Design a protein around this ligand. Sequence first.
Ligand SMILES: OC[C@H]1O[C@@H](O[C@H]2[C@H](O)[C@@H](O)[C@H](O[C@H]3[C@H](O)[C@@H](O)[C@H](O[C@H]4[C@H](O)[C@@H](O)[C@H](O[C@H]5[C@H](O)[C@@H](O)[C@H](O)O[C@@H]5CO)O[C@@H]4CO)O[C@@H]3CO)O[C@@H]2CO)[C@H](O)[C@@H](O)[C@@H]1O
Length: 582
Amino acid sequence: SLPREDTVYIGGALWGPATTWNLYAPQSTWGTDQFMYLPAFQYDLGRDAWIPVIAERYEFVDDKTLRIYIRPEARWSDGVPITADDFVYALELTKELGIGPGGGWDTYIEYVKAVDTKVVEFKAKEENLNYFQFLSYSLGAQPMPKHVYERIRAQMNIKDWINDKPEEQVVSGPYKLYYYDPNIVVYQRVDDWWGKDIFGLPRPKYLAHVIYKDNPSASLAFERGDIDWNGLFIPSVWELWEKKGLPVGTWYKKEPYFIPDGVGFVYVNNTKPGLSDPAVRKAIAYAIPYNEMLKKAYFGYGSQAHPSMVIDLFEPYKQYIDYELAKKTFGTEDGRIPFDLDMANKILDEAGYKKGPDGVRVGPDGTKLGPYTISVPYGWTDWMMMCEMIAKNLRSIGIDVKTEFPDFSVWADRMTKGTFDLIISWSVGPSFDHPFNIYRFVLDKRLSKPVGEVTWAGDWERYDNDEVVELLDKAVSTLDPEVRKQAYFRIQQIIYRDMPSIPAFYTAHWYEYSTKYWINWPSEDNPAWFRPSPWHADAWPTLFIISKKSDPQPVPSWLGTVDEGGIEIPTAKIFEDLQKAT
Ligand SMILES: OC[C@H]1O[C@@H](O[C@H]2[C@H](O)[C@@H](O)[C@H](O[C@H]3[C@H](O)[C@@H](O)[C@H](O[C@H]4[C@H](O)[C@@H](O)[C@H](O[C@H]5[C@H](O)[C@@H](O)[C@H](O)O[C@@H]5CO)O[C@@H]4CO)O[C@@H]3CO)O[C@@H]2CO)[C@H](O)[C@@H](O)[C@@H]1O
């Protein structure tokens, strides 16, 4: 049905059935955030700069008051101008519903206000001034169509709205839904997209994602040429081009093949009996076979995470790690947690957990350490294998854990609602505000929700610590890096004490491409965009960079900093402007 040469087929981004195209619903479908609803500015991790997208510029009124100027051209796909009211609406709705884009904004932002039709004003909250969050929530603000949502709300509960009618869909991005069924989701380019003159059009007319059940089936499709843009775990991926002579590639031609995405955690639900004990969580950390599982299950595609949660793959981040503390605590050369069952057993012994007749430990208050599950989505074979290795080792120390692999949608439900025991899941990655971003996402009770209520905003494990809140509130009250560092250092002490959840490995930014129909994919040799994975929040520029093999097009002129000839604003410039405005 779809013209092959005008379609990008995608793998590894959509797992389980389509759900909704509504960012205020408990679940939405891959492609909704990525391609349908764009931000004011798009952060460019690769260049540490910001693309003015829906916004054309900003101006600091003072260091705590930021105006964002919406492009005159920015217009919803139904013809209605994108206006400041749309920005206010999106954030106020998220606050009202307790779910939706920009969760947590009202903690660090005093107000968002429409000061003119095309001018939004954001004011930082002074009591707990945080310059990083001020910038994140403002520059990265996503508008949502007020005139559409107020309509839906008169008809039904917004949380129940599916938004699955292609003709009726109102979007700010260059794609909208075209067709879906239990086996596929397809998006079609919006040819009269508001951004067509400033950004050009993305090259593919259709984005199609067949819903594969597992990694092997998606891999089989990729090998035969039926997937152009892949975000999959693939065993021995180099064999695809080395041995099988396929026209496929990755970011790196050599080991490790993938750039890093962020931090993969073993999340441990703090609300569960047994798992609520810091001692038990610490024992679990020592029982994970880091090296062996990353070699065998993960094919060396990523390495062990530092327990500080800081991504030490990047030199500039190391200054934020208290290495002496980590080394002292864990007894290793760099402060990484060793795989040490003797230690895991000792920790449990000293916390008064004694093995019963069935070999499962029982605490002093009579709490048995099990039964528990460790769970990841069905078909995610690398994580599944990890889970088996972890579960076996936990069983050996007297924590009764068995693996369970439900459909993605069910897994996500249990994760977001905090009804899981153990899971492997993602967190956040490198960014201008790292590692504040990861402490905020993983440790901040303010982003969590009660057990039974969905949160995608953070703290799935329902960790609850008020000192961490205080530290986050003061960490960026000034831009002095020492203030930041000292807060991070104390947070690290708290992490090692409480083991709220376990940073385990640096997740791979899964990204493979076929050059059969589509060329000029980003890579080490063509590093045009540093977040090209099809599931990544920030993937969209990839679609403007590639072109048809039979109709090659030039590099987008807007990529690059202003000084280089593009339109991107370096982060340093934004901070300069902020400081100027004091
Ligand atoms: O290796 C195992 C397995 O991987 C399958 O590829 C996985 C990959 O491993 C995961 O890392 C990748 O995780 C990304 C998710 O796909 C994506 O949905 C999640 O998008 C974030 C987004 O970054 C964030 O901005 C969005 O914040 C909003 C919150 O949702 C709201 O709660 C809050 O209120 O408002 C903000 C908006 O301001 O949240 C979403 C959801 O977390 O980003 C993840 C990390 O990049 O997922 C891939 C699967 O799709 C691979 O396919 C298998 O082959 C392999 O076995």
